[PDB]
Design an enzyme around this catalytic site. Structure first.
Site, PDB file in Angstrom:
ATOM      1  N   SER A 145       9.966  38.904 -15.604  1.00 21.89           N
ATOM      2  CA  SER A 145       8.146  39.380 -15.208  1.00 21.89           C
ATOM      3  C   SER A 145       8.181  40.860 -15.978  1.00 21.89           C
ATOM      4  O   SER A 145       8.336  40.553 -17.078  1.00 21.89           O
ATOM      5  CB  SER A 145       8.711  39.050 -13.689  1.00 21.89           C
ATOM      6  OG  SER A 145       8.776  38.062 -12.385  1.00 21.89           O
ATOM      7  N   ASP A 241       0.608  31.443 -14.162  1.00 20.28           N
ATOM      8  CA  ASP A 241       0.839  32.557 -13.078  1.00 20.28           C
ATOM      9  C   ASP A 241       0.866  33.525 -11.815  1.00 20.28           C
ATOM     10  O   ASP A 241      -0.238  34.015 -12.005  1.00 20.28           O
ATOM     11  CB  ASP A 241       1.705  33.665 -14.072  1.00 20.28           C
ATOM     12  CG  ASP A 241       2.862  34.117 -13.515  1.00 20.28           C
ATOM     13  OD1 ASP A 241       3.917  34.303 -13.361  1.00 20.28           O
ATOM     14  OD2 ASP A 241       2.406  35.552 -12.970  1.00 20.28           O
ATOM     15  N   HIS A 285       5.426  31.387  -9.513  1.00 17.46           N
ATOM     16  CA  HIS A 285       6.507  32.191  -9.621  1.00 17.46           C
ATOM     17  C   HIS A 285       7.832  32.931 -10.046  1.00 17.46           C
ATOM     18  O   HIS A 285       8.023  33.429 -10.077  1.00 17.46           O
ATOM     19  CB  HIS A 285       6.112  34.333  -8.598  1.00 17.46           C
ATOM     20  CG  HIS A 285       6.786  33.448  -7.369  1.00 17.46           C
ATOM     21  ND1 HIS A 285       6.680  33.157  -6.779  1.00 17.46           N
ATOM     22  CD2 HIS A 285       7.854  34.740  -6.716  1.00 17.46           C
ATOM     23  CE1 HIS A 285       7.487  32.223  -5.870  1.00 17.46           C
ATOM     24  NE2 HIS A 285       7.990  33.729  -5.660  1.00 17.46           N
TER      25      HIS A 285
END
Ligand code: NAG
Ligand code: YI6
Length: 338
Positions: A145, A241, A285
């Site tokens: 991330s 995403d 995620h």
């Protein structure tokens, strides 16, 4: 278990001035080192950094950190959970600088917070050299991330740091997970531009020279910074995403169907010239430190296998490294996380 070490150089700090640090599990019979960058968004002015300090304090301070953590996924030491690098030396670097790992500014009379992410990475590397990193043959800088974007911004600086300190035999590589975003039109970049000014953010030098003063925000977007890098980098990115869809204000009629399909096609296009990549057609995620990271496959190959094939390639029949789904809708791959 990985054990906490707060940085001996106490001037390299989290947002609130407390010392930054790292969690370490050594593997005495290994010359492989995995340094993993945590994610968790960012903040970019006084008011929204104050909000983050109220409800996300562990991402801004080490005062409440636990003495140990369990390694999971690619940080697991169990071969069944981590077929790729289970015997490596494992390092988890907590994200406590709120700057996408780009900042180089101290708390001071003029700064309520410190933003030191780029210096935290450098100081962890420095202190690990005296704990066995000096004998490494490969240093893999990985992250998820905002930490995946941090890999892209910092991998070449770690290579330059080790070359200048006199360690040219250590091969530095990058693994960027879920950090490859598009600056696309929303369904219904300014925050990064403002953050850079607030943090005194730094970007890789070749990228900086292309985009020049005031346009360094461009270097936070993978498809623009990746061609400027010299270290080998493997890119992991869901085609759909959830953080990308969040900033695109998507939470199904014809207009939305076309928007989602066009997003997946554009992401796939940006990976055409990325030879080491793993990009499944999933809405997700979740990240490579989850226990079940071995379960997804693209064209019949898992991510642990693709990373092993990447290793072999940096020394292949049935050992691919470029794995990008071509089907156009979330979960058209049956192995997507459930
Ligand atoms: C501690 O870190 C700062 C920031 O990188 C650096 O300027 C300083 O020289 C370091 N101190 C020591 C003793 O290495
Ligand atoms: C463009 C780079 O900035 C970001 C990258 C990833 C995230 C998602 C997360 O950290 O969970 C948020 C911001």
């Amino acid at each position: 278990d990985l054990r906490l070490h707060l940085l001996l150089n106490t001037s390299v700090t989290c947002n609130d001035g407390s010392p930054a640090g790292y969690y370490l599990k050594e593997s005495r019979g290994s010359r492989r080192w995995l340094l993993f960058l945590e994610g968790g968004w960012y903040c970019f002015n006084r008011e929204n950094c104050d909000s983050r300090y109220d409800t996300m304090r562990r991402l801004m301070s080490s005062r409440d950190w636990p003495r140990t953590r369990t390694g999971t996924g690619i940080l697991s030491s169990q071969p069944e959970e981590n077929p790729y690098w289970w015997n490596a030396n494992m390092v988890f670097i907590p994200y406590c600088s709120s700057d996408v790992w780009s900042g180089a500014s101290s708390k001071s009379e003029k700064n309520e917070y410190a933003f030191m992410g780029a210096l935290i990475i450098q100081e962890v590397v420095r202190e690990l050299l005296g704990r066995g990193l000096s004998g490494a043959k490969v240093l893999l800088l990985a992250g998820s991330s905002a930490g995946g974007t941090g890999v892209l911004l910092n991998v070449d600086r770690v290579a330059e740091q080790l070359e200048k300190l006199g360690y040219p035999a250590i091969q530095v590589r990058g693994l960027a997970d879920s950090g490859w975003f598009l600056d696309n039109k929303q369904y219904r970049t300014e925050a990064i531009r403002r953050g850079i000014r607030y943090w005194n953010g730094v970007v890789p030098e070749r990228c900086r020279r292309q985009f020049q003063e005031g346009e360094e925000w461009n270097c936070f977007f993978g498809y623009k910074v990746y061609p400027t890098l010299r270290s080998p980098v493997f890119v992991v990115q869901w085609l759909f995403d959830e953080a990308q869809l969040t900033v695109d204000n998507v939470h199904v009629q014809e207009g939305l169907r076309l928007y989602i399909q066009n997003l997946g096609r554009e992401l796939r296009h940006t990976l055409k010239d990325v030879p080491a990549s793993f990009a499944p057609a999933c809405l997700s995620h979740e990240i490579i430190i989850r226990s079940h990271w071995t379960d997804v496959q693209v064209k019949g190959t898992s991510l642990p296998r693709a990373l092993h094939c990447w290793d072999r390639s940096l020394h292949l029949k049935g050992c691919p490294v470029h794995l990008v789904d071509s089907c156009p809708w979330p979960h058209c791959n049956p192995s997507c996380p459930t």
